[PDB]
Amino acid sequence: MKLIWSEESWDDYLYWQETDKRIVKKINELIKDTRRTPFEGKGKPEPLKHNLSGFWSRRITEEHRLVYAVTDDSLLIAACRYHY
Amino acid sequence: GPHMRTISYSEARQNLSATMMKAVEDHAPILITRQNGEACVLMSLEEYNSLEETAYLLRSPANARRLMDSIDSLKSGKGTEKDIIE
Amino acid sequence: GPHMRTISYSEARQNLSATMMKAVEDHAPILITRQNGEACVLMSLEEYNSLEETAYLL
């Protein structure tokens, strides 16, 4: 499965890349697990509603979530950091 | 007003098991009303967790904005493919 | 001790009214567990709508 990122999620990912490598490893583990089982597994996968229909959320930390959708071909990463 | 099925306190209490099972099966919420006014929604844990997680991601204006722009782009196919930086 | 946030279906059958009042009082959801089946959550209508309004982006 291919990994497609938005500018938002890409910036999020690089932020962690140059900020906290510990968080990076968690994100990679989640991506690798979702890749294996898109709707089940690590991070307590949760389907989203309304305007977010079609997307899912997994726990990076109690605060940060890996938000994503799945097409017949790849994994769309909407986010990997929570913002205030 | 509400846009969900309603059930009386008494019917729900007499048929709690069936009521919970239907909520779980249908993934739909139901409003239990007491003949004194009190009213609570009953929904499956699964549906609750989904709704709560959705509200959580949108609660923060800054996060809602980014997530909406991000989803917009992705749905439009404007997403860039990149591998994980091991 | 802390307010209850969980109750079994069996106990809920006979204490539903009190349980509803508690969910409303604390403006917090109560989980109704099921020995075999799936658990359900009970919450005030007010909390439910507020939650949907949020998930709807106002």
Swiss-Prot record, chain A:
The UniProt disruption phenotype note reads: No visible phenotype under standard growth conditions. Delays Lon protease-dependent lethality upon overexpression of Lon, but does not fully suppress it. No loss of ability to form persister cells.
Query: Which Pfam family name is an example for this entry?
Result: YoeB_toxin
Q: Kindly indicate whether the keyword S-adenosyl-L-methionine belongs to this entry.
A: no
InterPro entries for this protein? RelE/ParE_toxin_dom_sf, YoeB_toxin
**Family according to the record:** Belongs to the YoeB family.
The function of this protein is: Toxic component of a type II toxin-antitoxin (TA) system. Its mode of function is controversial; it has been proposed to be an mRNA interferase but also an inhibitor of translation initiation. When overproduced in wild-type cells, inhibits bacterial growth and translation by cleavage of mRNA molecules while it has a weak effect on colony forming ability. Overproduction of Lon protease specifically activates YoeB-dependent mRNA cleavage, leading to lethality. YefM binds to the promoter region of the yefM-yeoB operon to repress transcription, YeoB acts as a corepressor. Shown in vitro to be an mRNA interferase that requires translation for substrate cleavage; if the mRNA is mutated so as to not be translatable it is no longer cleaved. Cleavage only occurs within translated regions. Has RNase activity and preferentially cleaves at the 3'-end of purine ribonucleotides.
Identify this protein by name. Answer: Toxin YoeB
> Can you name the source organism?
Escherichia coli (strain K12)
From Swiss-Prot, chain B:
Tell me a GO biological process for this protein.
single-species biofilm formation
- Any GO MF annotation of the entry: protein homodimerization activity
> What's one GO-annotated cellular component?
toxin-antitoxin complex
- This protein's UniProt keywords: DNA-binding, Repressor, Toxin-antitoxin system, Transcription, Transcription regulation
- Knocked-out gene: effects: No visible phenotype under standard growth conditions. Delays Lon protease-dependent lethality upon overexpression of Lon, but does not fully suppress it.
Conditions for induction? Represses its own promoter; more strongly repressed by the YefM(2)YoeB heterotrimer. Induced in persister cells. Ectopic expression of Salmonella or Shigella toxin VapC induces the yefM-yoeB operon and also induces Yoeb toxin activity in a Lon protease-dependent manner.
Quaternary structure (record) = In solution exists as both a monomer and a dimer; the monomeric state is more predominant. It has been described as being a YefM-YeoB(2) heterotrimer and as a YefM(2)-YoeB heterotrimer. When complexed with YoeB inhibits the toxin activity.
Anything else known = Has been described as natively unfolded and proteolytically unstable in vivo, but also as structured following overexpression in vitro. Has a half-life of approximately 1 hour in vivo.
PANTHER family per record: ANTITOXIN YAFN-RELATED, ANTITOXIN YEFM
Q: Which family does it belong to?
A: Belongs to the phD/YefM antitoxin family.
Do you know which NCBIfam families this protein is assigned to?
Answer: phd_fam, PRK11409.1
Per the entry, what this protein does is: Antitoxin component of a type II toxin-antitoxin (TA) system. Antitoxin that counteracts the effect of the YoeB toxin. YefM binds to the promoter region of the yefM-yeoB operon to repress transcription, YeoB acts as a corepressor.
- Write down what this protein is called: Antitoxin YefM
